[PDB]
Amino acid sequence: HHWGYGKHNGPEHWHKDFPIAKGERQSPVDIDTHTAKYDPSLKPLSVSYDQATSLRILNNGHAFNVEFDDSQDKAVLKGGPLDGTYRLIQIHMHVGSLDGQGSEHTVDKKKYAAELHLVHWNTKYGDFGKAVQQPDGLAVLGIFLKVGSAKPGLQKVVDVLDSIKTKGKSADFTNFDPRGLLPESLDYWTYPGSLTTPPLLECVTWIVLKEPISVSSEQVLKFRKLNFNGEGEPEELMVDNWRPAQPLKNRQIKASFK
Numbered sequence: 001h002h003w004g005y006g007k008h009n010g011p012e013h014w015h016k017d018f019p020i021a022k023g024e025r026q027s028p029v030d031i032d033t034h035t036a037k038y039d040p041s042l043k044p045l046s047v048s049y050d051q052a053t054s055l056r057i058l059n060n061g062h063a064f065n066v067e068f069d070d071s072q073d074k075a076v077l078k079g080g081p082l083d084g085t086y087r088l089i090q091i092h093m094h095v096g097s098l099d100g101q102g103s104e105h106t107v108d109k110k111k112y113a114a115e116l117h118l119v120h121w122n123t124k125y126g127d128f129g130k131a132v133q134q135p136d137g138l139a140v141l142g143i144f145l146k147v148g149s150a151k152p153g154l155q156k157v158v159d160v161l162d163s164i165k166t167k168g169k170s171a172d173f174t175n176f177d178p179r180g181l182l183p184e185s186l187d188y189w190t191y192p193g194s195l196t197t198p199p200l201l202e203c204v205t206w207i208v209l210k211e212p213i214s215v216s217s218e219q220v221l222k223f224r225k226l227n228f229n230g231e232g233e234p235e236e237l238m239v240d241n242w243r244p245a246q247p248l249k250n251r252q253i254k255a256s257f258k
C-alpha cells in the first residue's frame with residue numbers, strides 16, 4: 001500500500017519510510033499567539049499573481065491539486081521573510097470531516113475547517129525538484145478556511161470537483177486566478193518548516209496568513225465529497241487529510257503584525 005491518512009498508513013507511520021518525519025523542522029505546528037514574536041523588520045509580503053497561468057486540476061489520492069505553469073516568473077511570491085523570487089507551482093487543500101477540524105496549522109490549539117497551501121519554489125534553484133533539496137527552496141502560503149459567506153474564488157474549484165472525484169482523475173483548469181483565494185489582510189506568521197506530506201523535506205519557509213477566508217457550508221460540503229480511492233474501489237471519502245501539529249523545538253515563530 002501507499003502512505004496516506006488512514007489508521008495503517010497515516011501520519012503516525014510516516015517516520016518509518018521517511019525518518020525525517022521526526023526531525024527538528026517539521027510541519028505543521030501550533031501557533032501560540034502569546035509567544036509568537038512580532039518582528040517589525042520584515043519587508044512587506046509581495047504576492048504578484050497578475051500573469052498567473054494554471055494548467056489542470058488533479059486528484060492524486062491525497063487532495064485536489066491545481067498545477068501552474070512555473071516555467072517563468074508569472075505568479076510569484078516575494079517580500080516578507082523571503083529572499084529572491086519564489087514561483088507558484090501548485091495549490092491543494094487539507095479538509096476535515098467536521099467544521100471543527102481540517103487545518104494543519106493551528107492557532108492557540110484551534111483548528112480551522114480547512115487549510116489552503118499555495119506552494120512556491122526558489123528561482124535560484126532552477127526547478128521544483130532541485131528546490132525541495134534546499135533548506136530555503138520552498139515558500140508555502142497557508143490560508144485557513146472558515147464557514148461564512150461563499151468564496152467566489154473557490155467556487156471555480158467547487159464546480160469541477162465532480163469531474164475529478166476519484167484518485168488519478170484530472171481536468172483542464174486554465175484561466176484560474178489564484179488571487180481569489182486570499183483574504184483581505186496579508187498579516188502573517190512565519191517559521192522554518194517542512195513539507196507536511198512525504199517526503200516531508202525540511203525545505204520550506206512557512207507563511208501562514210492570520211486572517212482566514214470564508215467559505216459557505218455548501219462549498220465545504222462539496223469539498224468533502226471527493227474520494228481518496230480510485231474509481232471502482234470501495235469509496236473512501238477524502239476528509240481529514242491533514243497532518244497533526246509537530247514539535248516546534250527551538251524554532252521561533254514570528255509575526256508580521258503587532
Ligand SMILES: [Co+2]
Pocket residue numbers: 092094117196
Ligand atoms: Co499541504
